[PDB]
């Protein structure tokens, strides 16, 4: 049962911009997603203070970076709060609707794309390097879901039947032909040291 949705006009406009604008400093994508992870880990650590049993889905609060040369993917996995189907489909794209506004006038004479995260729409930066992005997520307690988009105006949501994941979010970047550099170990280690030095959770870089 694959459902297909339209992006809100504004999000679509943002995605085309991210995909068409000439901009050489693409590496910022990793800071945005690692930071989205950080927030998601914060959220669950906070809520589990008044409700110890929300950790029943997983005690470890961490972030994994997993490169795969053969499939040509970089996956950022966290065990944070996850999203429900209503996050994925409505709630995230309604909030994104106005961060996209502000961010988009700042771009017209002045701000630059590297500032995208200040407007809470950092996730879309993944399109600097990915031709296709797939988000797998599990929130206590809804089912686990797979969101997917190659931009172009539309996205899909289906329930997921891949490997179960406790609780958490996986972002899988299917990188474009010319961005395989972000599958390189020293390359990942260089970007993380430089832009993500201080996250409050262990980050493990998987090797191939
Ligand atoms: C309470 C419901 N859970 C979430 O909002 C989550 C959103 C994310 C996100 C996330 C956050 C995102 O936006 C962050 C900015 N916001 C400020 C408040 C809500 C959205 C977007 Cl556009 C896309 C994604 Cl996939 N990433 C990751 N790794 N984990 C979670 S958990």
Swiss-Prot record:
Reported effect, residue 82 to D: Abolishes ATPase activity
Residue ranges, annotated region (Interaction with NR3C1): 1-208
Superkingdom to which the source organism belongs: Eukaryota
Annotated residues for binding of ATP: 36, 78, 97, 123
PTM info: ISGylated.
Compartment(s) where it occurs, according to its Swiss-Prot or TrEMBL record: Nucleus; Cytoplasm; Melanosome; Cell membrane
Chain positions with N6-acetyllysine modification: 43, 69
Domain notes: The TPR repeat-binding motif mediates interaction with TPR repeat-containing proteins like the co-chaperone STUB1.
The family this protein is said to belong to: Belongs to the heat shock protein 90 family.
Complexes and interactors: Homodimer. Identified in NR3C1/GCR steroid receptor-chaperone complexes formed at least by NR3C1, HSP90AA1 and a variety of proteins containing TPR repeats such as FKBP4, FKBP5, PPID, PPP5C or STIP1. Forms a complex containing HSP90AA1, TSC1 and TSC2; TSC1 is required to recruit TCS2 to the complex. The closed form interacts (via the middle domain and TPR repeat-binding motif) with co-chaperone TSC1 (via C-terminus). Interacts with TOM34. Interacts with TERT; the interaction, together with PTGES3, is required for correct assembly and stabilization of the TERT holoenzyme complex.
Known function: Molecular chaperone that promotes the maturation, structural maintenance and proper regulation of specific target proteins involved for instance in cell cycle control and signal transduction. Undergoes a functional cycle that is linked to its ATPase activity which is essential for its chaperone activity. This cycle probably induces conformational changes in the client proteins, thereby causing their activation. Interacts dynamically with various co-chaperones that modulate its substrate recognition, ATPase cycle and chaperone function.
Protein name: Heat shock protein HSP 90-alpha
Species, as recorded: Homo sapiens (Human)
Span within the parent record: 16 to 223 of 732
């Amino acid at each position: 049962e694959v459902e297909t949705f339209a992006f809100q006009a504004e999000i679509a406009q943002l995605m085309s911009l991210i995909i068409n604008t000439f901009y050489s400093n693409k590496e910022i994508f990793l800071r945005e997603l690692i930071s989205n992870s950080s927030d998601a880990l914060d959220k669950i650590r906070y809520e589990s203070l008044t409700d110890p049993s929300k950790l029943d889905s997983g005690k470890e609060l961490h972030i994994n970076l997993i490169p795969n040369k053969q499939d040509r993917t970089l996956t950022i996995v966290d065990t944070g709060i996850g999203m429900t189907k209503a996050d994925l489909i409505n709630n995230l794209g309604t909030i994104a609707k106005s961060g996209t506004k502000a961010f988009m006038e700042a771009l017209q004479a002045g701000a630059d794309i590297s500032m995208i995260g200040q407007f809470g729409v950092g996730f879309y930066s993944a399109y600097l390097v990915a031709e296709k992005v797939t988000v797998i997520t599990k929130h206590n307690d809804d089912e686990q879901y797979a969101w997917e988009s190659s931009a172009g105006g539309s996205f899909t949501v289906r329930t997921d039947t891949g490997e179960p994941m406790g609780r958490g979010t996986k972002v899988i970047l299917h990188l474009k032909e010319d961005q395989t550099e972000y599958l390189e170990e020293r390359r990942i280690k260089e970007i993380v040291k430089k832009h993500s030095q201080f996250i409050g959770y262990p980050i493990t870089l998987f090797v191939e």
